[PDB]
């Protein structure tokens, strides 16, 4: 059993993605976070559940939605959300 933790950088991504979706539908930005949530939390008891990332080694890919991927790493003491990205386009970006 591992506690679920997010990197400060994966949360900065969450705003950048939700804020962008709020411009058209504020509920779509909300619904996304609920599908994001429903992937991140299940990992506490089943961490080694999602396959390893091909593009980024040592990380695991969650295709939460056709256009969105959650990237996590299973540490010695926790499950760590590294970044959340758009599966098709280069978004969000570094600032």
């Amino acid at each position: 059993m591992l506690p679920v933790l997010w990197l400060e950088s994966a949360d900065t991504d969450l705003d950048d993605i939700t804020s962008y979706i709020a411009r058209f539908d504020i509920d779509a930005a909300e619904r996304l976070w609920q599908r994001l949530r429903g992937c991140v939390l299940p990992l506490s008891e089943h961490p080694y559940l999602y396959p390893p990332s091909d593009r980024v080694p040592g990380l695991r890919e969650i295709v939460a939605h056709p256009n969105y991927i959650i990237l996590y790493r299973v540490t010695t003491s926790s499950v760590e959300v590294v970044n959340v990205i758009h599966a098709r386009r280069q978004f969000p970006l570094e600032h």
Binding site: P3, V4, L5, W6, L7, E8, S9, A10, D11, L14, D15, T18, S19, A22, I26, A29, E30, W33, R37, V40, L41, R55, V56, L59, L71, S78, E80, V81, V82, N83, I85, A87, R88, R89, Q90, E94
Partner: protein, 57 residues
Amino acid sequence: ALSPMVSEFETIEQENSYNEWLRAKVATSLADPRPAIPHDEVERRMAERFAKMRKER
């Protein structure tokens, strides 16, 4: 070039440019010193985020 059934991209160079960007992004995110915050704090930062948006109406 790539067929949409074959890949989520458009060309072979897209499977290069995107994946190098992602590699650089993760490497930036890992090298970052700011310690990782637990799920319930992200949860808190979220409710605050949507609440601030709903107020702009």
